[PDB]
Amino acid sequence: NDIQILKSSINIAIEKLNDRISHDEQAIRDLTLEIENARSEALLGELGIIRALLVGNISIGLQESLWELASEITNRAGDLAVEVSPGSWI
Amino acid sequence: NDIQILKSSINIAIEKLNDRISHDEQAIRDLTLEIENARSEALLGELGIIRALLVGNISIGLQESLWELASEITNRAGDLAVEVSPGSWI
């Protein structure tokens, strides 16, 4: 009798909970996408500036520090799927 | 008898769970705030550098690449509520 009504009501309550958790897991999955994207933007923004200076008539020492700096920055960025713009040397 | 004691104890246990989930949802909400802020900082940091170069005596080609670069960066930043500093052209 009352055991079975209770069992089914448990099951609904747990379902709702799993709904809540799953909804948090998908948001934790969006955020981790948002973090990757933030990193990708900063990465492209910083290389974008470096390459703008590199393609100009800048002194030879600043070219050394900027190339080196491009690697360090690029090293810190573990590995995201970057796609730096075509470039523009001529 | 023992059905009712069991029902109330279920209800407490579920409450605690919903407490845990709600506490995760508020942290997922802080992080999404933290991500926006990280993006805003990188955005302001990169425009800050670009505008420092733009207001100086830099070559005319570097000015072209930097203005263009300011848009691309600003385009990648979907739309955050930016507030770039007043500027400083004179």
Added chain:
Amino acid sequence: NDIQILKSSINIAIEKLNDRISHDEQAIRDLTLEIENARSEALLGELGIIRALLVGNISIGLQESLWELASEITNRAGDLAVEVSPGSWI
């Protein structure tokens, strides 16, 4: 009789749920680590560019705007445990 079988089955179901939540909490903890790291990278990338310009033969006004800019950027970065490279002024 059937009350006790039901009680134990509740306990397993709740355990599984707490497992799920705890697994979300550790991921919310990784993301908050990932956000800090994204901020640290952008921070180092932007100071890296600024210091490359600062150590060169740049005009005196651009040096003013860049030093100032280094503080504003560094101020916006609440306080992360930064570790800017040794520097390189000579």
